[PDB]
């Protein structure tokens, strides 16, 4: 009689395990055969992707206050067959390898073998997690409802999907290319998308645009940071006309097309180097306990920041910390020079911490974001470092 109760019981049966992280801000519900070690890898993978995303997008403040994605729920069925039950249990399409629903802040997927998918669970999760990030920090309103989806519902599709594919390759220090994506790009240059074709792609065009959107995102990151910056700026601002104008300009630009084509050629040539950047074993090791005060002191030295705030959070297998500070640029040399300065500096800080004796520093992720000019017209950034404090 009580259908809702029966459904809750079914969820409990198929997803009997619950793992919580970050003082309850990440909840993972999973089948009894999904390994705890895998669950932990996904948590640390999420921090690598998060940090690269904030570095590039330049914002770590949710665009809206009080959305469902204040809590990220991850639902992992045991296998592809049990995943089909998600249509009945939760109500969402199971015709995919997983799906993120912004309105409930929930990603649904399943553990799988290499014979069931090209994509390992961590690889797929790293892609789909970026939809969560895009929904929260980059695209105003909800998916298929905000102003970016009105009128021309596919105007952002090439970027939303292409950038998700790209950010899946995040590491502690960069975003690296993915074999699964590069391998699909045509060996024949004449069959590859040009910029105009990509930048107007929609879901109804088929699925080739995902790989070419991936490649265009890697092209921007490595060779056209200004366009990447300019696009994300229009998105954060809900500036649909600005975005559209930028797409039209970029679609007709022969230098962008030449450089994009060259970049694809280089990706294809370097295919063997592009094994998916999955998280290191460094995250699973036990280390000595080290105090927050000492961690703060080391990070302040490595990054040249002062008066930082460090705070502990609890997960069920370990405690973590976030250190927050600001950094003021001695010299303003324009957007892209500043970006590179900060990206290099933050990576040098991570390298210095890595070279210290405490192994816990190998778990650290870091970003800079939200630049603004102070009263003396100096550029100030927010800085955040995240790391393991102690295993339980
Ligand atoms: Ca959103
Ligand atoms: Zn996607």
Author numbering: 339 to 730
What text appears in the publication on this structure?
Clostridial collagenases are among the most efficient enzymes to degrade by far the most predominant protein in the biosphere.
The peptidase domains of ColH (Q46085; Pro330–Gly721; 46 kDa) and ColT (Q899Y1; Asp340–Lys731; 46 kDa) showed sequence identities of 56 and 55% and sequence similarities of 71 and 74%, respectively. The stabilizing interactions of the helper subdomain with the upper segment and, to a lower extent, with the lower catalytic segment are reflected by their contact areas of 1060 and 418 Å2 for ColG, 1046 and 347 Å2 for ColH, and 955 and 503 Å2 for ColT. Consequently, the contact area between the upper and lower catalytic subdomains is larger by 42% in ColT than in ColG. This difference might point toward different substrate specificities in these enzymes; alternatively, the PKD domain(s) present in ColG/H might compensate for the additional quaternary stabilization found in ColT. As evidenced by the comparison of Ca2+-unloaded (ColG) and -loaded (ColH/T) crystal structures, the liganding glutamate side chain undergoes a marked rearrangement upon Ca2+ binding that allows Ca2+ coordination. Due to its location between the two catalytic helices, calcium binding braces the upper and lower half-domains of the peptidase and stabilizes thereby the zinc coordination. Notably, the peptidase domain of ColG from C. histolyticum showed a higher structural similarity to ColT from C. tetani than to ColH from C. histolyticum.
